[PDB]
């Protein structure tokens, strides 16, 4: 998936999950950026499903 909006440490990312149900299934997951930058799925953004 692709960073959609970039704040300082958070980032809204996109094009990866299809629905908020899938986000909620993976809502604590270790996500990773190929720069070697770890991160965590926090919460499903509401309107950009």
């Amino acid at each position: 998936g692709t960073p959609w909006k970039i704040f300082k440490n958070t980032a809204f990312i996109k094009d990866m999950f299809n629905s908020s149900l899938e986000i909620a299934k993976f809502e604590g997951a270790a996500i990773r950026t190929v720069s070697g930058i770890r991160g965590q799925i926090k919460r499903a953004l509401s309107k950009p499903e």
Partner: peptide, 23 residues
């Protein structure tokens, strides 16, 4: 009509099941 309320309560209930299973 009053089917969207059923969609929202079923959707949020399914989110409760998925979040309890996730944690």
């Amino acid at each position: 009509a009053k089917l969207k309320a059923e969609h929202k309560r079923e959707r949020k209930g399914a989110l409760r099941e998925l979040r309890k299973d996730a944690q």
